[PDB]
Structure 1
Amino acid sequence: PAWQPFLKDHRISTFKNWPFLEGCACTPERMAEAGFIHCPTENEPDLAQCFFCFKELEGWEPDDDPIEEHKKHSSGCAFLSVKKQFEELTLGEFLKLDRERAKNKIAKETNNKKKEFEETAKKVRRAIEQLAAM
């Protein structure tokens, strides 16, 4: 299925044109180990996203440890507390992780919608503030 993102090897494969290779701390192996997928755009060519909590990080430096960055920016991500390898998870555990991923993807869309609305509400509020002046 597309439970593929739970597989580290699938995650590593996303970093086809990730620029940070051998010599660096945030190599594709390390990024994939930490739960990241490479999601490059034009404004952000090193954009990476956790497959599980959906936190999006960019502006990577060579010395960045992906695990430490993931912890700093998204300290509650359940993926960070998975100590077993994928194949060692029980089905019950896997299913619970997959439910938690879905809850995470609702906190993410909700969050993006809130942000977008507030951008608009500020502009609107500003305009009406001017009218209320008389």
Structure 2
Amino acid sequence: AAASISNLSMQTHAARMRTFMYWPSSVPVQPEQLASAGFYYVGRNDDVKCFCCDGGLRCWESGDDPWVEHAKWFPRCEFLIRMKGQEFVDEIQGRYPHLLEAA
């Protein structure tokens, strides 16, 4: 069974892509990578949200993988779990935050 979707209007990849009209060229993550991972542009800075879980992410850095960030921050997202599988999410959740030594 499928649970709630926060934003039905953005459930399609094409709809999410259309939001990235004014995506800043300086950001080292591309609209297609974001849209594929469920994200659409909110229209300010580099803020995006997931159509399913309504999780917002910003301050995208060089080397960021939207699927990994999705799983790092919103592991309970149903779209994420169905697209990537629970094992992907669990792996990401076991990996981050990186271990710091001392206790």
> Quick check: TM above 0.5?
yes
Is 1:79 aligned to residue 79 of structure 2? yes
Paired letter, 1:14: T
Paired letter, 1:62: S
Whether the aligned pair in 2 keeps the contact of 1:38 and 1:49 (CA below 8 Å) is: yes
Report what 2:11 is aligned to. Answer: 6
> TM-score normalized by structure 1?
0.51
Deviation at 1:37, TM superposition (A): 0.7
In 2, distance between residues paired with 1:19 and 1:40?
Answer: 10
Report what 2:86 is aligned to. Answer: none
Q: How many aligned residue pairs are there? A: 77
Whether the aligned pair in 1 keeps the contact of 2:28 and 2:60 (CA below 8 Å) is: no
Deviation at 1:27, TM superposition (A): 1.0
Whether the aligned pair in 2 keeps the contact of 1:20 and 1:26 (CA below 8 Å) is: no
Bigger RCO of structures 1 and 2 (CA < 8 A, at least 6 apart): 2
Larger radius of gyration: 1
Deviation at 1:28, TM superposition (A): 0.5
Which sections of structure 1, spanning at least 5 residues, go unmatched?
A: 84-134
Which sections of structure 2, spanning at least 5 residues, go unmatched?
A: 1-6, 84-103
What RMSD in Å do the two structures reach over aligned CA positions? 2.1
> TM-score normalized by structure 2?
0.66
